[PDB]
Amino acid sequence: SNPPPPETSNPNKPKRQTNQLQYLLRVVLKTLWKHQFAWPFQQPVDAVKLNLPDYYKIIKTPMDMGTIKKRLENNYYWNAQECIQDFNTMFTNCYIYNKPGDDIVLMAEALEKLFLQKINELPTE
Numbered sequence: 001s002n003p004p005p006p007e008t009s010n011p012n013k014p015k016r017q018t019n020q021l022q023y024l025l026r027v028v029l030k031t032l033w034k035h036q037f038a039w040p041f042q043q044p045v046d047a048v049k050l051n052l053p054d055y056y057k058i059i060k061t062p063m064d065m066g067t068i069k070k071r072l073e074n075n076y077y078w079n080a081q082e083c084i085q086d087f088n089t090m091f092t093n094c095y096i097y098n099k100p101g102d103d104i105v106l107m108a109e110a111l112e113k114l115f116l117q118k119i120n121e122l123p124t125e
């Protein structure tokens with residue numbers, strides 16, 4: 001009924017760090033994960049439990065910080081921009097499904113402000 005969670009490991013990809021990928025795991029993800037508003041985003045949205053039959057009809061690319069965390073831990077991303085896109089998709093999903101001023105949107109907006117501030121200090125290429 002729920003979609004399978006996104007893949008988080010690539011079986012043939014070499015392990016390669018970059019300055020930016022190290023920053024995204026050790027600074028960006030770590031900071032957001034511990035925030036008091038992180039919990040609704042730490043795992044895929046369970047649209048069954050929340051009685052939202054239309055969520056996965058409206059959201060074509062589900063994404064969440066638990067998936068991002070595993071991807072970074074497993075070195076799934078080839079570059080930092082793929083990871084940044086996953087964060088942006090997560091926030092977009094919230095803003096296109098939920099009503100403005102819903103509590104979950106306020107929580108997303110607080111997390112996104114912290115995300116964008118950290119991205120402003122992303123190491124150079």
Ligand SMILES: CCN(CC)S(=O)(=O)c1ccc([C@@H]2CC(=O)N(C)C2)c(-c2ccc(OC)c(OC)c2)c1
Binds near residue numbers: 045
């Ligand atoms: C904690 C266990 N689970 C976590 C995924 S849960 O049961 O599925 C679950 C539990 C609670 C919430 C929020 C928190 C809050 O203040 N609400 C009014 C609902 C969400 C949720 C997250 C992101 C969304 O936007 C894309 C969203 O849109 C409906 C809902 C999910």
